[PDB]
Amino acid sequence: GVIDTSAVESAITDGQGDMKAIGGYIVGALVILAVAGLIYSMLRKA
Amino acid sequence: GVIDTSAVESAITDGQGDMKAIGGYIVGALVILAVAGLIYSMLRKA
Amino acid sequence: GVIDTSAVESAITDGQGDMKAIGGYIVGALVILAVAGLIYSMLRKA
Amino acid sequence: GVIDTSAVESAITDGQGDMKAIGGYIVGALVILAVAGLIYSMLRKA
Amino acid sequence: GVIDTSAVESAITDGQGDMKAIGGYIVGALVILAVAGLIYSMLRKA
Amino acid sequence: GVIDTSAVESAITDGQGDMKAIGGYIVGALVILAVAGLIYSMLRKA
Amino acid sequence: GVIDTSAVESAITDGQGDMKAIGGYIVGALVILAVAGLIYSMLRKA
Amino acid sequence: GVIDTSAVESAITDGQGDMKAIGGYIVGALVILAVAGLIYSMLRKA
Amino acid sequence: GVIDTSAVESAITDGQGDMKAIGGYIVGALVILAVAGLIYSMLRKA
Amino acid sequence: GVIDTSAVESAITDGQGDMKAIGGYIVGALVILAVAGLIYSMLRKA
Amino acid sequence: GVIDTSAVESAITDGQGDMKAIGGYIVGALVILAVAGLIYSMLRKA
Amino acid sequence: GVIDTSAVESAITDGQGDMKAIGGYIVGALVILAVAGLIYSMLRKA
């Protein structure tokens, strides 16, 4: 009496493979305010 | 069952390319108070 | 058996075109406290 | 399906025009401790 | 088949006219710690 | 459809009248290290 | 068709009378780091 | 409708009685660099 | 034609007497991060 | 009509007994930068 | 007229035994930003 | 009635092994402004 849920794992494993894609696109934008955070500290201490 | 997230990386890679633009516009204004910080020290020691 | 959702994309693409308008009106007000943040530092160091 | 956001830019452009007003009222009070900072140095060196 | 929403704008335009009243009562209390913030700096530098 | 906010201004105008009281109690303690700062300079120069 | 809300004001006026009690217990602990903040400044200037 | 806050004043009056303990342990270490600051001045003037 | 609701007030007055019991068990755990919040401030200022 | 909440106080009194354990492990690490803060001041004044 | 709920406690006591497992896996990742939070403070004070 | 959480510890132990990697990449950049902080002090004292 089953219902075919084969279209579930095919849909959301491709879903969770897309959460990883837009996680790496944020990490690449948070290191901008990490690098610029501490080369401001070099100019101030000088 | 995917949703097209192709408009994400096209939107925020151009976003993080703009954080770099206004980071270099601050560094050019912090060296003003680095140079003027230590040519004041030459006049005082004289 | 469809329902005409043509009035959806006509309504919210004009919606997301208005989020961009009031995003640029905030950026123009946050640079006021960025510029005035570091010309206070010039007067203090003098 | 828009919502009239015409009352937004009319409200905060007049808002950011007021941040400039109270920025210039602080600069006029930080030059007091810049001028008095270095006419104390004239009396001490004498 | 409308429902009279005339009691809405009469109720919340008088509501948002009261948010402005208690916004100006806070600004009058944040300038106390702005003025006293920098007449402490005059006594310390002396 | 208002809510009585008459207990707000009665509560925080008496609040900001108390920030002024403990601001003047600090100024009376910072002039101790201003006066003693420069009658030490008289004894050293002698 | 009312519901007796007489147990409301009896419960939260005694509630807001207790927020005042633990506000005064914090003020008595923030003046410790205000007094000790500026008798450290007397020892350093000496 | 109260909540027993009797465990508050029993917890932080013993808390603020401990801020006083580690304030007096710092004052005993700042007088070391006050005494040694001005018996260096006796050796230099000799 | 009533239905005996005498088992209601006997069940939920003992219910609301138990909400007070686990409210006082949280207040005893929030004062831990209130006391430790400001004896960290004594060590940093020293 | 009660629900047995005897597993509550047994769970969070052991919870708040663990907040005290990791509070004392931080105090032991903030005195490192208190002691080293003022034996740097002895070397500089010498 | 009962219904066998013996499969309930066998299912959720093993459920709450798994909430404890992934609670300890978070605590092991929050101490990374506690240790690195205050060995940054040693390098800055030096 | 369990749910397989074996993919949890495999995912976040590799997660917390990556927090350590980018902690050591910051420590290597804070010692730059520690070394340069005190070879500036040698040039000034000379």
Residue C43 tokens, joined = 């007067």
Where in the sequence is the domain holding D43, given as residue range(s)? Answer: 1-46
Query: Nearest C-alpha of chain K: how many angstroms from J22?
Result: 10
The CA angle F25-F28-F33, to the nearest 5 degrees, is 130
Residue in chain J nearest I46 by alpha carbon: J34
Per-position DSSP letters for A1-46, written without gaps between them: -----HHHHHHHHHHHHHHTHHHHHHHHHHTHHHHHHHSHHHHHH-
Q: Identify the chains in contact with B, defined as 3+ C-beta pairs within 8 A.
A: A, C
Q: Identify the chains in contact with K, defined as 3+ C-beta pairs within 8 A.
A: J, L
Q: Give the integer Cα–Cα distance in Å for K19 and J42.
A: 52
Q: In one letter, which amino acid is F13?
A: T
**Residues whose CB falls within 8 Å of the CB of residue D33, separated by 6 or more in sequence, listed in order:** E38, E41, E42, E45
Q: Give the integer Cα–Cα distance in Å for F27 and A37.
A: 36
Residue J39 tokens, joined = 């034996």
Burial of H12 (0-12, 13-18, 19+ CB in 10 A): buried
Q: Give the integer Cα–Cα distance in Å for C28 and D12.
A: 10
Identify which of B29, J21, G25, C13 has the alpha carbon closest to the alpha carbon of residue C5.
C13
Ramachandran class of G4: left when φ > 0, alpha when ψ lies in -120 to 50, beta otherwise: beta
Alpha carbon of residue J28 to chain centroid? 8
Query: Nearest C-alpha of chain D: how many angstroms from E36?
Result: 12
CB atoms H19 and I27 under 8 Å: no
Chain L residues in contact with K25 (beta carbon < 8 A): 8-9, 12-13
Identify which of L18, H21, D33, K45 has the alpha carbon closest to the alpha carbon of residue G29.
H21
DSSP-assigned letter for residue L46: -
Tally of CB atoms within 10 A around F26: 13
Resolution in A: 3.2
Cβ–Cβ under 8 Å, residues K42 and J32: yes
CA distances from B12 to A32, A34, C22, G42, J16 (A): 13, 17, 18, 53, 44
Residue F32 tokens, joined = 């101790």
Tally of CB atoms within 10 A around D34: 14
DSSP-assigned letter for residue I39: S
Q: How many structural domains are present in chain E?
A: 1
Q: Give the integer Cα–Cα distance in Å for B33 and L36.
A: 18
Q: Give the integer Cα–Cα distance in Å for L45 and L40.
A: 9
Q: In one letter, which amino acid is J45?
A: K
Cβ–Cβ under 8 Å, residues H4 and I24: yes
Query: Nearest C-alpha of chain J: how many angstroms from K3?
Result: 20
Tally of CB atoms within 10 A around J2: 11
Per-position DSSP letters for K1-46, written without gaps between them: -----HHHHHHHHHHHHHHTHHHHHHHHHHTHHHHHHHSHHHHHH-
CB atoms F27 and E15 under 8 Å: no
Burial of F16 (0-12, 13-18, 19+ CB in 10 A): middle
Residue with structure tokens 């919870």? J15
**Backbone dihedral angles phi then psi of residue K9, each to the nearest 5 degrees:** -65, -25
Residue with structure tokens 């034996």? J39
Identify which of B45, E40, C46 has the alpha carbon closest to the alpha carbon of residue L43.
B45
Q: Give the integer Cα–Cα distance in Å for L20 and L13.
A: 11
CA distances from B29 to A39, A43, B34, D28 (A): 13, 10, 9, 22
DSSP-assigned letter for residue D33: H
Q: Give the integer Cα–Cα distance in Å for G41 and H34.
A: 11
Burial of I42 (0-12, 13-18, 19+ CB in 10 A): buried
Residue J4 tokens, joined = 């047995």
Tally of CB atoms within 10 A around B33: 18
Residue H40 tokens, joined = 């260096």
